[PDB]
Task: structure prediction
Amino acid sequence: LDYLEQESGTKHAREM
Amino acid sequence: RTWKPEPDPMEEQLKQLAIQKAQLENQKLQSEIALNEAKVRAEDAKKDMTNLDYLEQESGTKHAREM
Result:
């Protein structure tokens, strides 16, 4: 899950 | 002639417990193989995460997201 979120930019999107 | 060798309760049981022990040992080995496979999968996931972190750092994606 952490790899998919990092690859898809979901973490970056949620950071903003 | 009419002599039936009496069975020994103890010596009887012990054998049943030894059979149970053998079965339990086989199940223990199976569980150990399962655990080793699970650890292999976990290490593969960690390797994938490390590869992702290396690619992001090399390509500057981390720097881009930092801004």
